[PDB]
Design a protein around this nucleic acid. Structure first.
Length: 59
DNA sequence: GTGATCGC
DNA sequence: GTGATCGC
């Protein structure tokens, strides 16, 4: 499940950026809220990283 | 510990 | 096979 809307993320290199996650999913235990997680690629470094998504980002 | 995901 | 992602 890939993303469409950009997300404001802090990259591994330390910079603020607005990137479209390549994949998004819910990361939540049974009976608990959890978080939403996006898999991102830093356009500068080429490095993949995971980052929290806003709670209303569409999964 | 829990939850899913995948580049490394 | 799992680090790293988060809030509970």
């Amino acid at each position: 499940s890939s993303g469409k809307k950009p997300v404001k993320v802090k990259t591994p290199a330390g910079k603020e950026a607005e990137l479209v996650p390549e994949k998004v999913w819910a990361l939540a235990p049974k009976g608990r809220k959890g978080v939403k997680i996006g898999l991102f690629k830093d356009p500068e470094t080429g490095k993949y990283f995971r980052h929290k998504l806003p709670d209303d980002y569409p999964i």
